[PDB]
Amino acid sequence: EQMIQSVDRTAVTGASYFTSVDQSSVHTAEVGSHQIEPLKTSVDKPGSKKTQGEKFFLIHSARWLTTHALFHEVAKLDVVKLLYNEQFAVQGLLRYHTYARFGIEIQVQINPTPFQQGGLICAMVPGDQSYGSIASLTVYPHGLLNCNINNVVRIKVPFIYTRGAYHFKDPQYPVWELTIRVWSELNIGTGTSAYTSLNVLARFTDLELHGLTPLST
């Protein structure tokens, strides 16, 4: 006896997170095939999680002035909360995911002219500063911006927090607080520009993302 073929009714298909359970289903119909280009229209690296979500972003832009006293807070930043914004390309990854754990890397940039003088400490403070001493900020990961020596500081920190991941929609408390204090006042002679500009660049390192979700906010 010969066997005459027939459709295979029940099948299960899907991709990533989704699933399809069909009673009546039937084989899928491909055409063509994936091709590689001999001549690349766009030579830059094809976008991915690491290209989009992990790049540098301009968080905050402030100015350090001669009328700021000692221990004045030049810029107070909630770092992650500012990275969650419509402006920054990391959003499109974060807006659709519930939870994320990640590192952070800060780059803070001043531009004093050599005729000015002063200093700054820029420290990464988990949670909030709470109480403890301003003198002791050197305990936290930090760097000292000195008008004489360096105009650039860089900081790299892992994920410190009391839970598994930082829920962006309804954030429990800010994971990091970046605080910029006048470590020694800015001083000038006559005619020297009375300020310095200050900018902050932040990005994620080792970003993980969980919980796809329709919630728009």
Place this chain on the structure above:
Amino acid sequence: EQMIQSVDRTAVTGASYFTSVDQSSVHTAEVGSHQIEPLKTSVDKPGSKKTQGEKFFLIHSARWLTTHALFHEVAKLDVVKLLYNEQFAVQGLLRYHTYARFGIEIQVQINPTPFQQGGLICAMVPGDQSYGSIASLTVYPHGLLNCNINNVVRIKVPFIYTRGAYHFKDPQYPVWELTIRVWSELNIGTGTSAYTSLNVLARFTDLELHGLTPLST
């Protein structure tokens, strides 16, 4: 003679697409290190391009009715244009990138009761249908929805287009057009439900992305 160390002034840092050229720069300060969890807070796969951008999405939802004549167009879809939307998690990848080349996979689902009868052809048409015959749709990648046999069709197609990539902000012309025609009319007896529901699930395969960009629209 002994050498006393000193700061290395000029350095170049950056990540992905960004670059920093500093004259005054200084070494970066790490703390801690990346840790792996012995107990996973979220067991699902960590999000990436392939989890977010390539999943299935509900494009269009229509109904095939007994009063649609032969060759009636049940649903006309511009597939990619509907995938570019605030609702769908692929957006956050597409909204920040200029160009993309990609595959497409369609799944079209009806639910006729065995007391109805009729058919459908669902074909992927590049560009526009233009003129050519409706009878000949079987040339395009397609599948035939038959109330007797299958309620599910699946289609997989590569990137067919006259350029390198489909620019989403100002799209030249639609890459794919999905057209659902009444291939033989829907017929019922007395009392049988007078319709069928019809839904479409589309996703990208082998998605590439180029051109990060601040343009919000």
Place this chain on the structure above:
Amino acid sequence: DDSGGFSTTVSTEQNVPDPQVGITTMRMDVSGVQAPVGAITTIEDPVLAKKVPETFPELKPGESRHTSDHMSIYKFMGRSH
């Protein structure tokens, strides 16, 4: 699948270009003395639509008696129009 897609069903290509040559040639009988298993099919299923259609007994139709193959594109459209 590379994109992360899975399924139980076998994914099979549809409408492959150039299945056959447009000139009559041999490359006995075609179908016969067995059965027309190829005369019943489900046209909706792309795995079953590639089944070689055969219905009655038939013979191999010899060789075509001119050299060129007029159903090639680079011949037909080679003629300037």
Place this chain on the structure above:
Amino acid sequence: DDSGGFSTTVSTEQNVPDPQVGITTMRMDVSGVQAPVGAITTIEDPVLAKKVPETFPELKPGESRHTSDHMSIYKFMGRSHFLCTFTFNSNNKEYTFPITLSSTSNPPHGLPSTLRWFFNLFQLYRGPLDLTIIITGATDVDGMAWFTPVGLAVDTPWVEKESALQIDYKTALGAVRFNTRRTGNIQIRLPWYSYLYAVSGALDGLGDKTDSTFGLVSIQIANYNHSDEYLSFSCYLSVTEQSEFYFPRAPLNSNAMLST
């Protein structure tokens, strides 16, 4: 770098924990007869701030003359330190106090003295604790204590009031039952039961109410006839060897350290 980051500069870790032992030991001269190359540095550069500071010639300072190392944490904080004290004024009453590492709490409700100091040195705390309660005054008083993890139903903290809960709900969490005639003291380890990774001591506002509470120890006493004298309790916390301390913070300013 894995994240795709690049740079020419050498990335070097900053403020590594436990560089040296806090006891004097040998593990000749320290510095001398060469130069104080270590006496000029750029403190802003984290590569150059790890240069061993040396200025004058010096000698190795022998061995310290006692065995133990008092600057270890598991020794120093092993000594049990004061927490609270309270007095029942009436029979058949319950009292519930949390262990709250938050510094927003000012004593008598909160951590006083050294505990308030210690739990603000670092960001995260994860692990069990040892707790000892000491009883004063009235005798022939039976009492029950039970430990309630956070989020579960419990009576209003830092308040003495009659029980709102069943004897069945109480005993299910586990309970000691003591008599102030026979013992007069108790020492018992508190488990680490939390839906959280750790419990941070420095937090504000919303996150302060949940993440900063370790758990609520409660005490109920019955058969207290107030014809007798006062009944005083006191609590003292110590740290086991299974506790872990993470990511040092800056210590508290002298105006934030209170006492009881």
Place this chain on the structure above:
Amino acid sequence: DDSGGFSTTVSTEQNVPDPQVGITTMRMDVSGVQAPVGAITTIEDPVLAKKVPETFPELKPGESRHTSDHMSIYKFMGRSHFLCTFTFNSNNKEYTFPITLSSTSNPPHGLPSTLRWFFNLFQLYRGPLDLTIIITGATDVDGMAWFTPVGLAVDTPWVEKESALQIDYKTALGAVRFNTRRTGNIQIRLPWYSYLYAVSGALDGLGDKTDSTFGLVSIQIANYNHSDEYLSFSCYLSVTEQSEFYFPRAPLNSNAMLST
């Protein structure tokens, strides 16, 4: 089959006890990169209901970070849970309460809270138990306790009345004799003496009065001068490692779980 029964269908066991451990451990990914063949099933067929359910891709959830496994029975129920409480109002009186696994008994006479819950999870119970009694209030009170298996002569249960029996009949069953001055607590294992295979907790009518009673613990106190304060007792049951639990039942509806 031995009984002479035949069939084509494959006979497959249903609801096997202890499929998995109740602690997170590893014994890569769980499911993925293949298909969710496990996401479609016929729950009516016992051969197809044992198919490991899997739907999406998932990862192995590491190891659980505490040692013990709290979903074991010999751990969870090892903690001793509340049973009853009672107070003598007069000297030279006896009190007798049974250990009755029946749920027809509604507390204060019966099993309350968790015990009432636990002994209704399964059909049969066979083995010894550990019992601890805790004494409150009056001091300098000697008392005797004795365990009486079922069917043997015993005074009216759940009732405080003067003894009907000899000191000779009492001491023959074995007895502790304690003084509430010195101890204030007792912990003692109860033997399994039964003419029955086990003692079931869910039964009605006739079979409920015999098969559901484990045994009757009694307590007699003498030298209680009621010029003193109240004398309170309380009892807490726990389960040894020689107890055995058989044939799981359906747990109690939320209207049948009472508290004390």
Place this chain on the structure above:
Amino acid sequence: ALASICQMFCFWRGDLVFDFQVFPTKYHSGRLLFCFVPGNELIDVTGITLKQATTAPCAVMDIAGVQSTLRFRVPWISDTPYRVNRYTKEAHQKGEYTAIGKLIVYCYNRLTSPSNVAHHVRVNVYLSAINLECFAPLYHAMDVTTQ
């Protein structure tokens, strides 16, 4: 059974396996969409349309077939290693949550059927657990949850 064991413990984690069983005839037809929306259980999910809910992890079952059941296994998605039994406590506290999300059920395609068959299909929802870890015993009598 799962609710009666898990009511006695403070903290629970694991995978919860929802077993859906339709009771159709062979002549009904239709599709359901079962969506999992990771978050706390107080998030307001009733405004989500159907196209938006295909973002979240979902599964679609067909009513009439040879298999009745679709088993929806919810992966563990949380920011904390555990969740907590809060129903003992009186009012709600942000940050302290029992559920890992809400499970929405839509009507993906309508229900079609002849005249002489019932116009609706009842659907049982079962519940079980796999990879379960619970600890910290307590005592609580879990009350009926009305939507």
